[PDB]
Design an enzyme around this catalytic site. Structure first.
Site, PDB file in Angstrom:
ATOM      1  N   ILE A 168     -26.171-129.687  40.018  1.00  0.00           N
ATOM      2  CA  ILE A 168     -25.323-128.745  40.735  1.00  0.00           C
ATOM      3  C   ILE A 168     -25.320-127.365  40.097  1.00  0.00           C
ATOM      4  CG2 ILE A 168     -23.831-130.556  41.679  1.00  0.00           C
ATOM      5  CD1 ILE A 168     -21.857-130.007  39.508  1.00  0.00           C
ATOM      6  N   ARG A 170     -28.095-124.637  37.507  1.00  0.00           N
ATOM      7  CA  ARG A 170     -29.270-124.386  36.684  1.00  0.00           C
ATOM      8  C   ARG A 170     -29.093-123.057  35.967  1.00  0.00           C
ATOM      9  NH1 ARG A 170     -33.938-127.246  37.799  1.00  0.00           N
ATOM     10  NH2 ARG A 170     -33.851-128.730  39.547  1.00  0.00           N
ATOM     11  N   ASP A 288     -17.573-110.841  30.888  1.00  0.00           N
ATOM     12  CA  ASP A 288     -18.791-111.231  31.592  1.00  0.00           C
ATOM     13  C   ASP A 288     -18.487-111.513  33.057  1.00  0.00           C
ATOM     14  OD1 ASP A 288     -21.498-111.701  31.909  1.00  0.00           O
ATOM     15  OD2 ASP A 288     -21.415-113.768  31.176  1.00  0.00           O
TER      16      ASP A 288
HETATM   17  O1  LIG Z   1     -27.168-121.904  30.241  1.00  0.00           O
HETATM   18  C1  LIG Z   1     -26.332-121.521  30.984  1.00  0.00           C
HETATM   19  N1  LIG Z   1     -25.507-120.375  30.630  1.00  0.00           N
HETATM   20  C2  LIG Z   1     -25.710-119.696  29.357  1.00  0.00           C
HETATM   21  C3  LIG Z   1     -24.884-120.370  28.265  1.00  0.00           C
HETATM   22  C4  LIG Z   1     -24.953-120.116  26.920  1.00  0.00           C
HETATM   23  C5  LIG Z   1     -24.032-120.943  26.291  1.00  0.00           C
HETATM   24  N2  LIG Z   1     -23.433-121.669  27.238  1.00  0.00           N
HETATM   25  N3  LIG Z   1     -23.974-121.295  28.441  1.00  0.00           N
HETATM   26  C6  LIG Z   1     -26.124-122.228  32.322  1.00  0.00           C
HETATM   27  C7  LIG Z   1     -25.553-121.545  33.389  1.00  0.00           C
HETATM   28  C8  LIG Z   1     -25.365-122.181  34.604  1.00  0.00           C
HETATM   29  C9  LIG Z   1     -24.715-121.409  35.830  1.00  0.00           C
HETATM   30  C10 LIG Z   1     -25.641-120.303  36.220  1.00  0.00           C
HETATM   31  C11 LIG Z   1     -25.038-119.390  37.294  1.00  0.00           C
HETATM   32  N4  LIG Z   1     -23.669-118.884  36.979  1.00  0.00           N
HETATM   33  C12 LIG Z   1     -22.744-119.904  36.402  1.00  0.00           C
HETATM   34  C13 LIG Z   1     -23.359-120.922  35.430  1.00  0.00           C
HETATM   35  C14 LIG Z   1     -22.378-122.134  35.388  1.00  0.00           C
HETATM   36  O2  LIG Z   1     -22.938-123.146  36.174  1.00  0.00           O
HETATM   37  C15 LIG Z   1     -22.089-124.176  36.595  1.00  0.00           C
HETATM   38  C16 LIG Z   1     -22.260-124.691  37.878  1.00  0.00           C
HETATM   39  C17 LIG Z   1     -21.450-125.715  38.337  1.00  0.00           C
HETATM   40  C18 LIG Z   1     -20.449-126.247  37.507  1.00  0.00           C
HETATM   41  N5  LIG Z   1     -19.542-127.225  37.702  1.00  0.00           N
HETATM   42  N6  LIG Z   1     -18.784-127.376  36.601  1.00  0.00           N
HETATM   43  C19 LIG Z   1     -19.193-126.503  35.692  1.00  0.00           C
HETATM   44  C20 LIG Z   1     -20.278-125.747  36.239  1.00  0.00           C
HETATM   45  C21 LIG Z   1     -21.103-124.700  35.766  1.00  0.00           C
HETATM   46  C22 LIG Z   1     -25.757-123.507  34.739  1.00  0.00           C
HETATM   47  C23 LIG Z   1     -26.331-124.188  33.675  1.00  0.00           C
HETATM   48  C24 LIG Z   1     -26.515-123.544  32.467  1.00  0.00           C
HETATM   49  F1  LIG Z   1     -27.080-124.208  31.420  1.00  0.00           F
END
Ligand SMILES: O=C(NCc1cc[nH]n1)c1cc([C@@H]2CCNC[C@H]2COc2ccc3[nH]ncc3c2)ccc1F
Ligand SMILES: [Mg+2]
Lengths: 618, 339, 57
Positions: A168, A170, A288
């Site tokens: 859900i 990436r 952010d």
């Molecule tokens: O790697 C990623 N981010 C960089 C970082 C560095 C340290 N922690 N994260 C990172 C990002 C994302 C997306 C990308 C788009 N925007 C939002 C962000 C959050 O994604 C979601 C989606 C659905 C959800 N349901 N519950 C929680 C949740 C999160 C997804 C996976 C990742 F590894």
């Protein structure tokens, strides 16, 4: 696969474990979800002195949660004419004079705020501690609290405790999966980060900081932030257990829907503000804020996510330029200039304009062009005068002219004439209909071909020692709403058939602690006998029949924690060069047995030295 | 100064007592008995082995029936053994783990024990439907109970690490009499046969003779070089024997007010834990820290025999009132009956 | 340090001094006479047959 509670004999080891940490006060057990449920389960059924005290407390907490004044007028009379007026006619009303005068004074004037019965809250507590709280510790309900508390302090999660489903989300450092915790069936999200993707991209600092930020926020149950329940790691992955949000982010929905109207953006604005208020009350700047970091649940409500770039400013303020270009505040881009929560309110104005006009206000693809256009502001004609006033105040470059930075925080933004039509209590209760309701399940609703050729050294693994974590308020709430009732009933049946089927060896003596452990006989045969051990000031007995063998504190030379077959166990060294290894059923038991055995032999050996009949002579 | 005079006067009195004693030593017990024939290599075998007691044994005591005995163990238990069949009559779980001494009453209805809990506990045995429980907890000492012995079913004498002894009324729990005089931890006491006197050995390297009914100390016996761990009366009540950490037993006569005999050998180096006389008083049995019990000729000081059982310290022993057998308790959890 | 303690010690030594003692030859003989008068009543000195011995059958 279900939850197994330990036998009530766990109480002996757990009650000492908690007492060494001061966790057996009224202020600390009453404020826990499972503790409150068991404490009231005792006061309502097992006692008649405090039954009206707790039902009074529960009727007040219901009254606080009343939505309208029309309902508070009808409830305040009932609570008064039952838990105040009737108790006062029987003279058995144990409350101060100022408490009755405050409630009655408001009822004569008929002014009924949700905090009407707050003076009684302070006194109902004082009447429940020190007296009723002591009879409660003696009862079988506090034993049940020790059983449940033992399960919590023995949590060790791995990927096998979750049934992982579809993707859900990436990102650059990993993926996010929708998963189910088989323990209780609670639906969650699993954020998996690749350590090998972390080392190459030099993102070690982010993942570490994200866990710290999730820990500060995941308390209090905020409906507009993606909060954390557990954190664990496998040899090559970091895993966060977060709120389930399977509706994509706004950066995706903005392309599929186009720009939003003022009224549709007003919804997303209000909920994001309440989430920012939650982080600012806990001294966290998000810096952010962009449509990519705003997810949608199945119904269309939104939360803030990915606190990787958020930092704590409760002691020292940041100054480095961190964020996404187009949303960074002017004082954020200026390296060397400090800033506080003021950065978020400027990023808000950037994001809110992007939902209305499709692009960042400072746009058309060069980063240095965006940094300069916003460093030192025209608004389209299709903006209402109240909307102009909000963005103009939010996008002020001077920190002294920017709305939400003038000494009151998020309350200043709420009082903007752009939100003159909203009831923020209804916003908090998620009562306003979301504009966009996500579909049944699309692809890459949260996105942005190289791999790697590196491995993980032992030194890199040392940064992930203190990564495991369990938020206590989250686990108890998860259990309370799933299996806390049916498990208590099943355990009550098993403990009842045990008593109806079966003289304790510990009472009437000077026993220190008793319970189950497993001593090892022949290691080549994987022989582990499970006996019930009794610790006395001078010996350690065990049985399976009466105790037939024991071990004296004079024999013990040292107590060491060791590893046996990837399991932590205790190692005792005996006078005759012999060794004696024990194994506990849970981590608190091992921590407590090690502490008490160390104190028992050190105190016994020092006492025998000064007794001529008992000590050793040449 | 008066405190200087009372010290010089106490010094002259000590010299006066020493000269009065040296004036009675016309002969020695070794010279007197140099004519009677020796006993001759006393050899005894183990007849019963009392198994149980999950840890060390610290004290035992025979009953007047010359059949039942009680013992106190490191496992916080008293066991009343039937010596004839090795059947455990009663197994008493104590309220304290630190037990050091025990005693069987002359009537056989009560037993007593105690230790680092600083309390002498009177356990009743005649209450209906079994279940032997505490009938009285005697509290008053400010130190560990080292030894206790019954007079009747209503009076018991105790010795403690507070450098005192005491006499109790079991019915009311009152400390009737305190016997002050020792300057170190009192270790053992023995009653005279007429039960109007008792002796006591302590860590001040001195034994003392007390009048039970008058509550005073009558005579003080020096001579040992270290702690006196055990003390036992001679069957007629005119003499007693002591066992010390100096690896010697000594015989003291009351009417002569001085030591008569020293029981020692060059190979024996470890200290004595317990002592007892045979029925006729001819044999002196002493338990040692080298896991052995030695049988002495009390009249000629020769070594008669050695009870070579056990694998750890012999912590206690005792002869029955009929002289039929000798029991020994050890640090190896066992009791053996020698005969 | 205590004056009353020094009086109590001197008075005690008077008690131990003002007693009537006997010659060691006398005390030694009376002890020897007891062992002779009861040597036949001592099962440890004089062996006892197995029938009278309760710990052997
Ligand atoms: O790697 C990623 N981010 C960089 C970082 C560095 C340290 N922690 N994260 C990172 C990002 C994302 C997306 C990308 C788009 N925007 C939002 C962000 C959050 O994604 C979601 C989606 C659905 C959800 N349901 N519950 C929680 C949740 C999160 C997804 C996976 C990742 F590894
Ligand atoms: Mg800056």
């Amino acid at each position: 696969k279900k939850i197994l509670l330990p036998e009530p004999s766990i109480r002996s080891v757990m009650q000492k474990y908690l007492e060494d940490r001061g966790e057996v006060t009224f202020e600390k057990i009453f404020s826990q979800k499972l503790g409150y449920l068991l404490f009231r389960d005792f006061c309502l059924n097992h006692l008649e002195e405090a039954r009206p005290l707790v039902e009074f407390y529960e009727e007040i907490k219901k009254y606080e949660k009343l939505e309208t004044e029309e309902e508070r007028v009808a409830r305040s009379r009932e609570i008064f004419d039952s838990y105040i007026m009737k108790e006062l006619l029987a003279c058995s009303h144990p409350f101060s004079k100022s408490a009755t005068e405050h409630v009655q004074g408001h009822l004569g004037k008929k002014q009924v705020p949700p905090d009407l019965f707050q003076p009684y809250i302070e006194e109902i507590c004082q009447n429940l501690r020190g007296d009723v709280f002591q009879k409660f510790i003696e009862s079988d309900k506090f034993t049940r609290f020790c059983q449940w508390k033992n399960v919590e302090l023995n949590i060790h999660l791995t990927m096998n405790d979750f049934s992982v489903h579809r993707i859900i989300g990436r990102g650059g450092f990993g993926e996010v999966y929708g998963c189910r915790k088989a323990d209780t069936g609670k639906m969650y999200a699993m954020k998996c980060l690749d350590k090998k993707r972390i080392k190459m991209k030099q993102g070690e600092t982010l993942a570490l900081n994200e866990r710290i930020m999730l820990s500060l926020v995941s308390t209090g149950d905020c409906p507009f932030i993606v909060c954390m329940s557990y954190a664990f790691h496998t040899p090559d992955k970091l895993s966060f257990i977060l709120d389930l949000m399977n509706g994509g982010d706004l950066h995706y929905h903005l392309s599929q829907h186009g720009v939003f109207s003022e009224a549709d953006m007003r919804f997303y604005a209000a909920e994001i503000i309440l989430g920012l208020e939650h982080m600012h009350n806990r001294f966290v700047v998000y810096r952010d804020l962009k449509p990519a970091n705003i997810l949608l649940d199945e119904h269309g409500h939104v939360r803030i996510s990915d606190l990787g770039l958020a930092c704590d400013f409760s002691k020292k303020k940041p100054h480095a330029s961190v964020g996404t270009h187009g949303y960074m505040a002017p004082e954020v881009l200026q390296k060397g200039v400090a800033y506080d929560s003021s950065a978020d309110w400027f990023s808000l104005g950037c994001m809110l304009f992007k939902l209305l006009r499709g692009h960042s206000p400072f746009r058309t693809k060069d980063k240095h062009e965006i940094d300069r256009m916003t460093l030192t502001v025209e608004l389209p004609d299709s903006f209402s005068p109240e909307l102009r006033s909000l963005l103009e105040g939010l996008l002020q470059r001077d920190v002294n002219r920017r709305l939400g930075c003038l000494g009151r925080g998020a309350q200043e933004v709420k009082e903007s004439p752009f939100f003159r039509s909203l009831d923020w209590q209804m916003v908090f209760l998620q009562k306003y209909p979301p504009p966009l309701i996500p579909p049944r399940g699309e692809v890459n609703a949260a996105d942005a071909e190289d791999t790697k050729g590196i491995k993980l050294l032992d030194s890199d693994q040392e940064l992930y020692r203190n990564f495991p974590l369990t938020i206590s308020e989250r686990w108890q709430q998860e259990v309370a709403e799933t299996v806390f009732d049916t498990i208590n009933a099943e355990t009550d049946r098993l403990e009842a058939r045990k008593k109806a089927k079966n003289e304790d060896y510990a009472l009437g003596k000077d026993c220190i602690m008793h319970g189950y452990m497993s001593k090892m006989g022949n290691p080549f045969l994987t022989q582990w006998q499970r006996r019930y051990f009794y610790l006395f000031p001078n010996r350690l007995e065990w049985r399976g029949e009466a105790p037939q063998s024991l071990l004296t504190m004079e024999e013990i030379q040292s107590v060491e924690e060791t590893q046996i077959k990837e399991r932590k166990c205790l190692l005792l060294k005996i006078r005759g060069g012999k060794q004696f290894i024990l194994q506990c059923d849970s981590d608190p038991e091992l921590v407590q047995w090690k502490k008490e055995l160390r104190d028992a032999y050190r105190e016994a050996q020092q006492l025998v030295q000064r007794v001529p009949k008992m000590k050793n002579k040449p | 100064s008066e405190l200087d005079q009372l010290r010089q006067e106490a010094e002259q009195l000590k010299n006066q007592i020493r000269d009065a004693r040296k004036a009675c030593a016309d002969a020695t017990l070794s010279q007197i008995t140099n004519n009677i024939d020796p006993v001759g290599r006393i050899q005894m075998r183990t007849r019963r082995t009392l198994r149980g007691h999950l840890a060390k044994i610290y004290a035992m005591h025979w009953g007047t029936d010359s059949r039942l005995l009680v013992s106190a163990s490191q496992d916080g238990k008293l066991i009343i053994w039937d010596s004839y069949t090795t059947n455990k009559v009663h197994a008493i779980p104590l309220r304290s783990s630190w037990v050091m001494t025990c005693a069987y009453a002359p009537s056989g209805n009560y037993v007593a024990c105690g230790g680092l809990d600083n309390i002498c506990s009177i356990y009743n045995l005649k209450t209906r439907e079994g279940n032997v429980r505490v009938s009285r907890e005697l509290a008053g000492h400010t130190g560990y109970l080292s030894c206790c012995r019954f007079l009747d079913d209503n009076q018991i004498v105790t010795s403690s690490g507070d450098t005192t002894c005491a006499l109790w009324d079991i019915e009311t729990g009152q400390q009737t009499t305190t016997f002050t005089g020792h300057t170190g931890d009192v270790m053992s006491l023995s009653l005279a046969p007429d039960t109007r006197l008792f002796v006591s050995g302590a860590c001040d390297a001195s034994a003392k003779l007390w009048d039970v009914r008058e509550g005073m100390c009558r005579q003080t016996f020096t001579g040992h070089e270290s702690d006196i761990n055990a003390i036992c009366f001679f069957p007629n009540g005119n003499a007693f024997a002591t066992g010390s950490d100096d690896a010697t037993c000594r015989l003291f006569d009351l009417r002569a007010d001085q030591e008569l005999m020293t029981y020692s050998h060059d190979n024996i180096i470890c200290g004595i834990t317990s002592v007892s006389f045979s029925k006729s008083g001819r044999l002196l049995l002493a338990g040692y820290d080298d896991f052995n019990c030695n049988v002495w000729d009390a009249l000629k000081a020769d070594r008669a025999g050695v009870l070579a059982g056990h694998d750890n310290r012999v912590s206690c022993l005792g002869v029955t009132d009929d002289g039929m057998a000798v029991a020994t308790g050890s640090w190896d959890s066992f009791l053996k009956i020698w005969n | 340090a205590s004056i009353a303690q020094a009086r109590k010690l001197v008075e005690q030594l008077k008690m131990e001094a003002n007693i009537d003692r006997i010659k060691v030859s006398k005390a030694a003989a009376d002890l020897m006479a007891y062992c002779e008068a009861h040597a036949k009543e001592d099962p440890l000195l004089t062996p006892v047959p197995a029938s009278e011995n309760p710990f052997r059958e």
